[PDB]
Every structure is written in C-alpha cells, then in structure tokens.
C-alpha cells in the first residue's frame, strides 16, 4: 500500500514527464495545434492522477 502509493506517484510523475511543453513559437496553425493537443493530454493526465490518488486517499 505504501510502496504501491510511491509507485503510483512515480508513475504519475512519469506521465507528466512524458508530455513536455512543445516549442512555443506560434509560427503556423500547426504550432497552436500542438498546444491544443498538449492541453488535451495534460487535462487527461490530471484526471488520471486524481482518480488513481483518490483510491489511496479513501
């Protein structure tokens, strides 16, 4: 449970580390596309985090 919790946090940390911010140049519609795609993925990681953590917090 304590080692599970640590492993879940190291995992959540990995997920956040796997979605780094893209180059903010604002050059093309493709630059703002990447930002939109980054945000969706961030929100998803935020939601996956809360749900995983709530199983450890009760």
């Amino acid at each position, epitope marked *: *449970s304590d080692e*599970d*919790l640590l*492993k*879940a946090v*190291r*995992l959540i940390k*990995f*997920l956040y580390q*796997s979605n780094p911010p893209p180059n903010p140049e604002g050059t093309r519609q493709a630059r703002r596309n990447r930002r939109r795609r980054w945000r969706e993925r961030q929100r*998803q990681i935020h939601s*996956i985090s809360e*749900r*995983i953590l709530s*199983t*450890y917090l009760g």
Partner: antibody
Amino acid sequence: QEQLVESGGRLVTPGTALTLTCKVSGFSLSGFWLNWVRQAPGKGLEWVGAIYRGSGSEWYASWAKGRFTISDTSTTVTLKLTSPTTEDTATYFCAADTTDNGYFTIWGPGTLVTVSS
Amino acid sequence: ELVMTQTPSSVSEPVGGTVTIKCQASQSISSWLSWYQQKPGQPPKLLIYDASNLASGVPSRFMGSGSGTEYTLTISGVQREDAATYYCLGGYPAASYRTAFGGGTELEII
C-alpha cells in the same frame, strides 16, 4: 498497424520456470499499459498484471504477486511464471490499452500453457 | 482488492429479444468500466468503453450504462451472431484496488 503476438506456450511439469513473450509492433504510442490476461480451459478471463511501457512500473493482481514477473523490452513485454502449478494451466493473452483510460483495445491471439506431470 | 460481480451466469434468448447483463463493483470505479465479447477459439473483443461509449465496429444494438456501483450491458435486438460469452472489466492497473474481470455471462440464442 497495431499488433500483439504471444509465444512461449509449452507443456511443463509443476515448478518449471517459464517465460512468455508478447511481440509488440506497429504502436505509434511510446508509453501505454501492456496487460496480461489468462483464461483456464472453460473458464473466465483473469487479469494477471500490467507494465506501463515507457517506465518500469509493474502492477500485479493480489494472487499474481511473487508467482509472475512482467518485464519490458525494446520490442517486447515478457511474463515469467516463477513456479507454476496445475492451477496455472491457461491460455495467456497480452492486451494493450491505447488511451491510458483502462480499457483494452488490442489483443494477441493467446499462447497456451499446460502444467502437468 | 476490486471484485466485479457479474450476473447472470447464462442467458438463453430468441432472435429479436432484449438481453440485460449486470456488473456490480466492490469499490467506486466511476467510468473505469468496459464490456467484452468472446467467441470460441478467439481473443475477446471490446464492445463498450468508459461505461457507456460504443466501440468502433460494434452494432448499435449493444448499449452500456452505469449508475454508481451498478453497470449494465443491454443487447436490444439479439442476433444469432451475438451467441458468445460476455465480460466486464472494472478499475485501473495503478489503482489501490487494481483492475478486475467479472465472472462472465454465457449467451445462447434460440
């Protein structure tokens, strides 16, 4: 595109350490949950465990811990049966979660393990 | 830790009838619930994801719903090809309670 192929299924005597391999191909994704599911003949599906592919994050069912080891490779995910018994006779499938949302979208055809003397 | 109680164990229904399959979660899983169809000699196939969403390539007669701890798989106009065994999958691999399959439902068509 996305493909999973399991191999290593053999006839073994009890206590014979065995490794099954899930050949992972055509996945655009880097990190994803690669799950191991088993089915004894005429029985239901049972979750064994999973590994989150980018990391070394292994998760096991309460009954699976100590008896199974999931390991990640460059192009593969392995499942080692440390000390099999007759109760471990089953078809073992690998199943990938492509979204991180918990559900299994891609499955392998399975590999059969028979534990008998 | 997580236990998914699936009922009934077996159902016999004539072509055109409605099939109701239930899964009860031992812990709060929210939308972490999916339904699978398995036919002999084949791996299982995804039907419903996130409790109520229809998966790609699945007939519209397959419906998923969830209220708290109770989850339902409805097959409205049962066809001969729907004869199979059905399973729910609850939870998440990194959740404190892990992830678990229900005991399955064997559907036979009259």
